[model samples]
Target: GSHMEFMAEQATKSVLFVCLGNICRSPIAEAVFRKLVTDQNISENWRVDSAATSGYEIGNPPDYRGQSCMKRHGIPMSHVARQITKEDFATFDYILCMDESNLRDLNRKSNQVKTCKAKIELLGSYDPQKQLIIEDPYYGNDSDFETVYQQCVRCCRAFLEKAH
Candidate 1:
């Protein structure tokens, strides 16, 4: 009834972002998408997370440069680096990644599981600008981080629209 304040809806949509180290592209994507969800007041309808495709960075914060870039974009982010696990495939609705390597690694792992539950893809595939790749900015300067942020904004916005 309209009287119900918290009416039951379908399960919350869940998304996971992935990069090589979880310090650059993936974390940035997660932050951009998160703020997108929050700003829409639909944050309660989604679960957002990011992880690494490798153990290269198991317990570190996002790269300082990326953090600085997000600050400029007015999005606050706080997340530790984590390697994606086999179980994430079962729990998340989508596993979005930066580049081909991440897609390959995740696909390989997903193949090994008995049943794969996540739809993994390159996040940039959703970019209306048609940029189909989210390049890594780890070794670049501040400007590169800015580029990454813009790509995340484009792709994340596109994804959210598609989801709705």
Candidate 2:
């Protein structure tokens, strides 16, 4: 019964997607990853969300361009921007982020948490194609948003497959 009890107590895998403002890359990544897990019928075993490294857009929905991009891909995204918290470091199993700035900010924040447990890394690290960075598309046009979506699709799929 020890094995059964331990299995029953096992925690669900959790991921927090992070970026500079949470309006663009991070939310897109979150929605793509969520859809991927849902498609595999493993959504129940995962906790997915997104946050910002900066507080600039807190309480704001994803950027208009990112929303349109997700809509185009049939991925439902409805998250308000929020800054990373000390508690998140102890909460998520993986704190996958967009680029170097996000990684740097997350690492800095992790140091502030006395018992940080999350594995913070660039989300693009999971890309099977070796595209190891998801750039911000906030100032770019629709094409840039599309690029972000494509990168997320590739990376999220790879990550889910590996994690499974």
Candidate 3:
């Protein structure tokens, strides 16, 4: 019984952050959330990662601007961008998308998992104030990345709080 209880408690909650290319927003979100967990000393109970809705950017590292922006905030660049997979739906507790179009794509491609999709949600829904999905800044400059970082921090903090 004790061992069973330990197993139950050891179950790590996972979140999948999705963006158009995975190099910009999602990867940054992953690092920011991971840093938050480390800062709070709860890395043991949580799992966070990022992916792209498109296959175009698969296996690439975060874009130069994205990496530089995150580096400014002390977030390390460790994740290589990858496209989302059907298995991700079953693996992650939350499938968070950057925009409505990406959400639609995820819902369509991952139909089997979409059938029971209560876990799927927009990442911005976690924000206490601005509950809007973080916008894509692929065309914008470094300032846009900063804005996205702020949104991720707010949402990630909300996620951590809600986890408790």
Candidate 4:
């Protein structure tokens, strides 16, 4: 909650969700978290978005399966795939990676922050319960995406609790 208190003192809190490819997991995370914050009436104080570790899916929309999965859950996926860049290191208040690999890639690419390194963190870090990484579903079936969605919801909700 200290993090949220810090955020509340600022004008707005910005989050950047990230995964291997923006098309599937990260987009879902972006949308789900945005919806959760909006519904909770704190959207005005927060900005949620997503990016990719690689540029393979840049300029592309989310994978159809991922879109359908979110749709089924009443979460909208409207983000275009985007690769993470050095600018992001200084832009977002929080950088939430979906997995360890992505986190490593992000750090390898850019480690610049004005004050400290606390801005970069894993989405799952908010979960004091399990503290596990959110598995990537690119190699799995529909159920995998659903499972990721649920996990994102948990972390995002925790994030909102602190933000509010």
Best by lDDT: 1
The C-alpha stretches of model 2 lying farther than 4 A from their native spots are 1-10
User: For model 4, how does the per-residue alpha-carbon lDDT over 1-164 read when each residue is reduced to its tens digit?
Assistant: 57666445537788989988898888888998889878877787787788888889999999888899999998868888998877777677888887889878778766454433237778888765665799888888999988888888888888767832
List runs of model 3 lying over 4 Å from the truth.
1-10, 112-118
* lDDT tens digits by residue: candidate 1, 32-132: 99998898888988999999888999999999888888888788679999998888989998999999988888888998887678998999889888888
Better of 2 and 3 by lDDT: 2
Per-residue lDDT tens digits for candidate 3, residues 1-164, read 57575435557778888888899989988998899888876788887888888889888989899889988898878988888777787677888777898888877877765444337778888888875878889989989999999998999889777942
Using TM-score as the measure, what is the rank order of every candidate, best first? 1, 2, 3, 4
Judge candidate 2 against the unseen true structure and give its global Cα lDDT, from 0 to 1: 0.87
Off by over 4 Å in 4: 1-10, 112-118
TM-score of candidate 2 versus the correct structure, residues matched by position? 0.91
TM-score on alpha carbons, each prediction:
0.93, 0.91, 0.87, 0.86
Count of backbone collisions in candidate 3: 0
For each candidate, the alpha-carbon lDDT, in order, equals: 0.88, 0.87, 0.82, 0.81
* lDDT per residue as tens, model 2, 70-107: 89889869898999888899988999988897788788
Please identify which of the two predictions, 2 or 3, would achieve the higher TM-score against the true structure: 2
Among all windows of ten consecutive residues in candidate 2, which has the lowest summed lDDT?
Answer: 1-10
Candidate closer to the true structure by TM-score (higher is better), 3 or 4: 3
